[PDB]
Every structure is written in structure tokens, then in C-alpha cells.
Design a protein around this ligand. Structure first.
Ligand SMILES: N[C@H](COc1cncc2nc(-c3ccncc3)ccc12)Cc1c[nH]c2ccccc12
Lengths: 336, 20
């Protein structure tokens, strides 16, 4: 580990300092489907002719990014993403732009969203939830080790590859920070107390979000939910969590410490770092080395019926990709 | 049941992230 992370720091740092650019053109890919849509962009399942491969292509509307004041976050996304590398992170093969858009061609994850599965299914057996947690756990070890705060963990963001493992996506809020940060962002239900209570915060929030994930993977629902955001933030800062009947003793334990409002007592931001997580009772059955090597027994193999199959993703009204005759946000994105 | 309350709630879909 220690020996490993270092090597990884030098690798990341090298890519981070001289990040790639214009590694392809739109007209090199073939549009196929819209795997997801939102705020200022959409992600399509695309085919790359020259090699016949598939990739998901995140498309960002430069002007829609400027309006939502996300210029700085979009630059972080591409920069961090091309510089990073880990067994549970989507590879960013290509990235480019044109008069109207920003493009990030990622590796296709035929498995679909965790979210999609956890909802249809309902909840996950602790052995199944724990399998995923662990992965998110290491990934967070990797990320943090590089002075990186993910800031937007949520089922809607964890994909499942053929082997049945996690593929963290969406680095829209990923940021390389040493020390406190104030940027208020993320998804409500997973917001850390600090973040809502506008008091500056650090990685400690990536562990709180983690505890939230696990809870939702093992219970079927979030420990903090309601019909409107205010309501929810009010539940998080309240410091009152309620666990189901079927949550083992150990689990209720690990969760209590992660959903800790007191960040001088929150598992992860402590003196022993991430080992307080790797060495917890609820995790004893876990062989962290086996996981890193994708040699564990995937508790759920999402199967697809053929390359390009997309029966694991929901449907979205296909839209058009139009690029104005004029550059749109030149210097605002000059380094993408 | 909590699980029941959850499904009647309009937060059981893909949850969007908060910006500004
Ligand atoms: N929360 C979602 C974000 O989803 C994603 C963000 N980044 C990479 C993503 N990659 C995939 C993906 C990648 C590779 N294979 C299969 C699926 C799916 C969703 C992604 C929905 C969303 C909200 N606002 C957006 C703005 C632009 C694109 C998606 C969204």
C-alpha cells in the first residue's frame, strides 16, 4: 500500500502537470444512445470507428456550464480525470471540444447504474453491500492520497462492469485540495453536516457520504430523506440516525462512527486514517488485497446480451448535437 | 414502515446534484 500509493502519486502528478488535450474529434465517433441526462449535459453510448470500440461520451454545453457557474468544476473534472488511474475508476480515453461543446469519451460500462439495481431489487445483503463499500473504500484511499476530494458519491454515480465491480464516474466536483475548502456542492441526501453548515470542510465528507452509501445499499433507503431538501439537511445536522432491525450489530457500529457529526471522532478523519475503516469488525471478512485485484467473488454479475446492449440503462429522449458556426466560450475553456 | 414512506416520497428517483 504505502509502497503503492507513492508510485501512484508520481504517476498522477506527472499526468496532472502536463494534461492531455484534443485527443480526437466528434466525427470519429458514432452516436447510439443517451445513457443519462441532466443539468448542463448528457452522456451517450458511442462507437469509435477506427477501432470499433464503444465508450460513453459525456457532452458538456459550454454555455450551459457558464450559466450555472461550473467553469472551474468542469476544468477540475477533465484535469483530475485524465491524470488519475485506478481499478475502480472509469478510464478517460479521449477529450476534446468544438465551437459548442466539451467532450469526455470514457470507457463504456455495460452494467448500468448501481442505483438502477438497488431500486428494482430493494436492498442488498450485507455481504453484497460490503463488497461494494470496500471498493469505494479503497478508491477513497487512492483519491485522498492524491489530495483529491471526490465530493459527489451516490448510487446514481456507481456503474457495474461485466465482472460485477464498481466504476466511479462523475468527477464534476472532484477537486485537488490540501486543506479546507468551502465550495458548497454534492447531492442533498449525501451532504455532510459541515458542508450544509457552511463551515469549510475536508476529506471528512467523503467518508460521511460513504457511510450514507452503505446505509442505502443495506437498507433500501437513505438514513436522511424527505420531500424537500431543507427537510433533509435538517435531519442530517440533527444528529439522529435510526437503523432497521436487520442491520447486524457490527454494521450499526461502523455506520454510527461514519455518520459522526463530530469530525474529530469520525472514522476516516482520525489519527489512524483509513485503517479505522479497513480494520473494523464489520469488515473483518474482507480481504482488501483480494478486492484490489478483482479476484473476489462478485455477488452480482450484471449480464448484458452483446456489445452495445443497453438493457441495463433507462431510456431518454434522444436529442441533437448542434455546434454553432462560431466558437462559444473560448478563453473560459482554453485549457480543456 | 420507513420503506413505505420512502416510496411515497418524490425522492426515489435519480437525485440531482446541487450547485449554486
Ligand atoms: N448524476 C448523473 C451524472 O451521471 C454521470 C456523470 N459523469 C459520468 C457518467 N458516466 C456514465 C457512464 C459512463 C460509462 N459507461 C456507462 C455509463 C453514467 C453517468 C455519468 C446525471 C446528471 C446530472 N447532471 C448531469 C449533467 C451532464 C451529464 C449527466 C448528468
Amino acid at each position: 500500500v504505502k509502497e503503492f500509493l507513492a508510485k501512484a502519486k508520481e504517476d498522477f502528478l506527472k499526468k496532472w502537470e502536463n494534461p492531455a488535450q484534443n485527443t480526437a474529434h466528434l466525427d470519429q465517433f458514432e452516436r447510439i444512445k443517451t445513457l443519462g441526462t441532466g443539468s448542463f449535459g448528457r452522456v451517450m453510448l458511442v462507437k469509435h470507428m477506427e477501432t470499433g470500440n464503444h465508450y460513453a461520451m459525456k457532452i458538456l454545453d459550454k454555455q450551459k456550464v457558464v450559466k450555472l457557474k461550473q467553469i472551474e468544476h468542469t476544468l477540475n473534472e477533465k484535469r483530475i480525470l485524465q491524470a488519475v488511474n485506478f481499478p475502480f475508476l472509469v478510464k478517460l480515453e479521449f477529450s476534446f471540444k468544438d465551437n459548442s461543446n466539451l467532450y469526455m469519451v470514457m470507457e463504456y460500462v455495460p452494467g448500468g447504474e448501481m442505483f438502477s439495481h438497488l431500486r428494482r431489487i430493494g436492498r442488498f445483503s450485507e455481504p453484497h453491500a460490503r463488497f461494494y463499500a470496500a471498493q469505494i473504500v479503497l478508491t477513497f484511499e487512492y483519491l485522498h492520497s492524491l489530495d483529491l476530494i471526490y465530493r459527489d458519491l451516490k448510487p446514481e454515480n456507481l456503474l457495474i462492469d461485466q465482472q460485477g465491480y464498481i466504476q466511479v464516474t462523475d468527477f464534476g466536483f472532484a477537486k485537488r485540495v490540501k486543506g479546507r475548502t468551502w465550495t458548497l456542492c454534492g447531492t442533498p441526501e449525501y451532504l455532510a453536516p459541515e458542508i450544509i453548515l457552511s463551515k469549510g470542510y475536508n476529506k471528512a465528507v467523503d467518508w460521511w457520504a460513504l457511510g450514507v452509501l452503505i446505509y442505502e445499499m443495506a437498507a433500501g433507503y437513505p438514513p436522511f430523506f424527505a420531500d424537500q431538501p431543507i427537510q433533509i439537511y435538517e435531519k442530517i445536522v440533527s444528529g439522529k440516525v435510526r437503523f432497521p432491525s436487520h442491520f447486524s450489530s457490527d454494521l450499526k457500529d461502523l455506520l454510527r462512527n461514519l455518520l459522526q457529526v463530530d469530525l474529530t471522532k469520525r472514522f476516516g478523519n482520525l489519527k489512524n486514517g483509513v485503517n479505522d475503516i479497513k480494520n473494523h469488525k464489520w469488515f473483518a471478512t474482507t480481504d482488501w488485497i483480494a478486492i484490489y485485484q478483482r479476484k473476489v467473488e462478485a455477488p452480482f454479475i450484471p449480464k448484458f446480451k452483446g456489445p452495445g446492449d443497453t438493457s441495463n440503462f433507462d431510456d431518454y429522449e434522444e436529442e441533437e448535437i448542434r455546434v454553432s458556426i462560431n466558437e462559444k466560450c473560448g478563453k473560459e475553456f482554453s485549457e480543456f | 414502515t420507513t420503506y413505505a414512506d420512502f416510496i411515497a416520497s418524490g425522492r426515489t428517483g435519480r437525485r440531482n446534484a446541487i450547485h449554486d
